[PDB]
Nucleic acid binder design. Structure first.
Ligand SMILES: [Ca+2]
Ligand SMILES: [Ca+2]
Ligand SMILES: [Mg+2]
Ligand SMILES: [Mg+2]
Ligand SMILES: [Mg+2]
Lengths: 152, 153
DNA sequence: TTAGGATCCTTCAA
DNA sequence: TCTGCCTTTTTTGA
DNA sequence: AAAAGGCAGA
DNA sequence: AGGATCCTAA
């Protein structure tokens, strides 16, 4: 677990509150115990012209990668343990996405117990809804109520 | 009056401006100005109006400027030359993507007195406007230093 | 089964 | 003439 | 985001 | 920005 410089975290928190996204998803999948998987992602988008700024993030954060979609590029961090460490340090400085960050942390902490009980998995799905409600969500499909058909 | 801004504020805000902000220089045709154009310099931060509270707070923090709504979004705007120069002076050290535009704005503001004095000097400052627009993701710009160049009266 | 990655779309919020 | 505000539009860059 | 414009008082 | 869906090593 890298400890990040405070002045870097201050600047990055501002940048993230601007061009960043803290995303939580429920994805249907038949192979998973409760027929769904949780996915958590920290992302920063930039026009591919400024991909260099994202390549620098990779180096400064120490983990994650940059993916180019053509017009725009994304810094992506998904790996659970580094994500938890990163958001823990970032969160105090966030002003617009602080709640989403803290919901992500809470979800991560509950993942072990979420795989053992459908009631617990559902509850955790409800925190995912909460993150989506905080985001400017516009194309969401799978919600905790989708999951609530573990009511079989 | 030359408000002094605090370090942790400037650091966070520099980040946020590199994200959702814009540092804009324009040449506005206007027949009642000395050389038939007015230079306008703007610092702007955009956000969805549901988050206008964040922009209103920027008025309190920067201590000048104002917020306007427009469709589904809001903008903090600072265009007043003396405070804008003071603010960008202190913000610039921490900018990463918009540092050059901020410094060009400062250079422009410092030359304005003597831009009113020579057409050739007015033209050169206009080329600094050009450079800022180049650095930005410019897509609907119309009036450029070249427009100004006649002026060949 | 699980976790992370790869690839792409949708609709704005800049 | 000048300068602080205002008010809308275009096209993405998120 | 990054322009385009307009009005009015000093 | 904020999702969606497919894939495959572990
Ligand atoms: Ca919302
Ligand atoms: Ca450009
Ligand atoms: Mg934003
Ligand atoms: Mg941006
Ligand atoms: Mg943005």
């Amino acid at each position: 677990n890298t400890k990040y410089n405070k002045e870097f975290l201050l600047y990055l928190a501002g940048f993230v509150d601007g061009d960043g996204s803290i995303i939580a998803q429920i994805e249907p999948n038949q192979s998973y115990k409760f027929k769904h998987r949780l996915k958590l992602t920290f992302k920063v988008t930039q026009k591919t012209q400024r991909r260099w700024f994202l390549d620098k993030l990779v180096d400064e954060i120490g983990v994650g990668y940059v993916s180019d979609s053509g017009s725009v590029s994304n810094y992506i961090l998904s790996e659970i343990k580094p994500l938890h460490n990163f958001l823990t340090q970032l969160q105090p400085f966030l002003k617009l996405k602080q709640k989403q960050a803290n919901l992500v942390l809470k979800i991560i902490e509950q993942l072990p117990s979420a795989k053992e009980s459908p009631d617990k998995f559902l509850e955790v799905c409800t925190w995912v809804d909460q993150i989506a409600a905080l985001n400017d969500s516009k194309t969401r499909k799978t919600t905790s109520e989708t999951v609530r058909a573990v009511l079989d």
